[PDB]
Structure formats: structure tokens, C-alpha cells
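Posting here for the record, re: magnesium ion.
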Amino acid sequence: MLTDTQVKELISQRRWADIRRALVDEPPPHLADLLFSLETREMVLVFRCLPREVSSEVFALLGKGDRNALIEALTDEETRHLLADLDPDDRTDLLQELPGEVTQRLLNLLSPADLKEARQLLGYPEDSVGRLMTPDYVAVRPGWTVAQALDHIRRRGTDSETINIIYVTDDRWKLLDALELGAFILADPDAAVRDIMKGSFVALSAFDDREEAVRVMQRYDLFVLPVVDSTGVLVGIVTADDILDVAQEEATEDF
Amino acid sequence: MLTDTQVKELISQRRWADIRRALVDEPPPHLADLLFSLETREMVLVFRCLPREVSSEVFALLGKGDRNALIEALTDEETRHLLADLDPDDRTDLLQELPGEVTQRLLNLLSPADLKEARQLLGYPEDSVGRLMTPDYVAVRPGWTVAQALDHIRRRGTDSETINIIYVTDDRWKLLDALELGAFILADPDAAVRDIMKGSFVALSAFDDREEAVRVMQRYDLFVLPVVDSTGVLVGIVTADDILDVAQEEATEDF
Ligand SMILES: [Mg+2]
Ligand SMILES: [Mg+2]
Ligand SMILES: [Mg+2]
Ligand SMILES: [Mg+2]
Ligand SMILES: [Mg+2]
Ligand SMILES: [Mg+2]
Ligand SMILES: [Mg+2]
Ligand SMILES: [Mg+2]
Ligand SMILES: [Mg+2]
Ligand SMILES: [Mg+2]
Ligand SMILES: [Mg+2]
Ligand SMILES: [Mg+2]
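Prediction output follows.
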């Protein structure tokens, strides 16, 4: 419960260790509130005090002004480190909102694989599902056993957007099913994944409009939706937290 | 992919078995679409053909007119069976929208424990979180081991709204934490639940406005939120599918 007043005094006293200790374990939304209530110079300073695992989350929560100001201020390495750790859809959201030359130097701060990822995601139309989606889903093969699937989920879990739905893909990565995480812990560990499939699923197109993601998510009452290309290959997922934001970006735009 | 045309012919032929076979494994939203495109007499007839485990889901998806017409038409036992199987928040949604004497005979069709449940949930203010919430969450004790928690989740899973977040409560059922299901499958089965708690959580009040559920869910990017009473006792949960509906009931009401 550290206030704008207490941080600004600690800054004035150059009590940098006390600041970093005071920021430990604060929820990212609460850190985003503090950074907003600060003035630009101190907001930039407190942001750099954060561990990079925290500051990437907080960055995604900031307003456009604070976000843009913060981009105008961090160094090349600090920026490079934010772009690496941002979730791919959050990385896209920044690049579509920034001016061209700024997005372009940002792009040059990405690693080759991250450049290819970011290039692909910005390449879907604006207001498309492809541009809302993240490729950090967890997928399993139909021929794996449930125990093997569970070891894959455990290895890959925290590095991924969500594990609450697990996707099944074939060898050519085409989407076969969408399974709740619970199905794997209710099932017999020696059963194949194919034993717990129903073979029916809802999926979006990457070229769907963002509002279709809202309509489809309301229709089927799911918290995550897979996105497939024209051949049925799984290319990413969209999650309910981002879809709720779309619902009220689109709602106010109607007003 | 059974159409309004094919069902109406089967009805005219009195091919009731063929109808029940044609409805097997159709997603509830697709059944709700078919029932809407029908006329009232056939919609009521096809609804009764459904297994009660299906028809309860479909009922929650229907429009107010079709829903109300269907209440005017099912028998006392058929109504009794719908009210039992409806999720408690979906049961509330029907009772707050129906006229008084109709809600009152409905109430008399409930079992004692279901009457006490429904009475309590309608007793929160209209437009409150209490009236959005369902008590069908899954909770564990902090002193249980992860293996014991996992057996409780398995016993209680499909009878509950979601298992994607598991709540920790003490002996007096006060909320101690909110844990992702993944935490239990990553953890050592012999660890206590208290070993995987962080002891911090977001919770709503039952007397919060429905729009606060929207604001809090957007703020913390969660798919489920617990609801606590003034003493901190867990009383229910709200889920993102219902909150997305609130967001656009409230959005259009602004327009
Ligand atoms: Mg994110
Ligand atoms: Mg548009
Ligand atoms: Mg990555
Ligand atoms: Mg819905
Ligand atoms: Mg996201
Ligand atoms: Mg519009
Ligand atoms: Mg429901
Ligand atoms: Mg209101
Ligand atoms: Mg019940
Ligand atoms: Mg949010
Ligand atoms: Mg519900
Ligand atoms: Mg309003």
C-alpha cells in the first residue's frame, strides 16, 4: 500500500533499495495505478526499479500517454528487454498504436524469431482477430498418453498464456480438439489423449473481425478461443480478458 | 446440422425417435438457434425431446419470449426438473425477469434447500453481484495436502461452475486465497495447500454493483472472481461469460 507521496520522498532521499523493497509483491494493476499518479520523471524512474518480470506486466496496463512517454525515455537495452518479455499480443498492441518510425526502431530491437513473430502478427488487418491473438498456447498430440500430456503441460505452463484449455493438433499442426485442463486430471494417466477427445470445437479465423471474437465468445461461454488459418492450422489463441476490452472499445465507439 | 425444415417434417411424421437421435451431441447454442427459428408449438415439443441434462443448458440460452412461452407451456414436473438443473445464477436470471405470481409458483416448485438457495440469491439487490453469482465453486482447506485437494477437485468437478480457480477457506469458510488449477498439478502431491498459497486475492462484495464486477474483472484479467460477505466468508463466484453479458447489457443501456 505504497503511495505516490512515500515513493517521491524515497526518490528525493535516493533510497533506491527501500523503493525496490517497497515494490515487491505489489499487484501489477496497483503498480500501474502508482505509476499513473506520478509525474513522468518519477514514473520512468520507478518503472526502471521494477524487476523486468514485473515491469513487462505493468507496461501492458499503462495508459497510452504514460506508455508512449515511457518509450520515449527508456534506453535501447531497456526497450529491447520489454519487447522480449511482453506477451506477443501485448507487443502487437503497442506497435499498432505508436507512430511509424517509432514502431520501426522498436522492430529493429527485436531478435530474429521475435521479429518474425511480430511481423506476422502485425500483418493481419487492423481490428482483426489475428492481431488480437497470441501464439503462446499449449498443444498436445492425439497419440500421447494423458501422463505424457501432463508432463508437457507442466514443462510449458508458466511460459504460456493459459493452460486452462489445451489444444490437440496433428502432425501438420492442424486443430483436432480443445480440452479442458480438468479432463486431463480426471482421466486415467495411461489413456491416450484420443480417449478424452470429442472431436468438436469452436475456432475463429485470424481474418475475423475483433467483434466476431466477442460474439463467438458470448455464444459458447468459453474463456479462450483458438484461431485457425484457412487450412485448419492452429495459429494462436484469444482470451476473455482481451475480449472484454474489445467489447467496451467497440461499445463506446458506438456512443 | 439439423434444420428447422427437417425437424418440422419429422414432427409431422411423428418420428419422435429420429428427432431425439438427430438432436444428440448438438451444441446447446445450436439447439437454441433451432428452437428460436421454430414456431412456439414445435419449439416446446422439441425442447421436451431433449435430455434434461441438455435442455437445462439450452433454456439458459433462449430469448425472453421463447423462455417465457416455454414456461407457460411445460408441465409442473417438467418445470420442477428445469429449476433443479439450472445453474443457480441462471435460475436467478429467470426469476428476476418473470412476473410476480409466475416467479411465485416457480418458487413453490423448488425443493427446500433449493428454495433457501434461490430465496437468498434473489434477496440481494437487483443489479447486484450477489444476484449475478453462483455458489457452485470448489473450495479446499489450507491444511489439506495437494493430493487430497486434487481428490476433492475430482469428486466435485463436473457438479461445479468451474475448477479453473480453486478457493481456499478456513474452518469458518472465510476466504484465504485463490489458486489456479495448474498450481495443484505443478506442485508436489505431498505438499500442504498452504505451501502453494500467496495469501493475496481479489474479491467482490455481494452488494457491489454488477458493473463493478466488470471493472474488477478488467482490472485484474481474471476469468472468475470470488464474492465475500462483510465478514470475509466466501458466498459465491462470478464468471467471465456472465460478466461479458453484463458489459454489453450496460453498454447498450448507455446508448
Ligand atoms: Mg498479457
Ligand atoms: Mg471495426
Ligand atoms: Mg515467445
Ligand atoms: Mg454467453
Ligand atoms: Mg492477452
Ligand atoms: Mg460499431
Ligand atoms: Mg450457466
Ligand atoms: Mg445499474
Ligand atoms: Mg445445487
Ligand atoms: Mg484487463
Ligand atoms: Mg453463470
Ligand atoms: Mg449506465
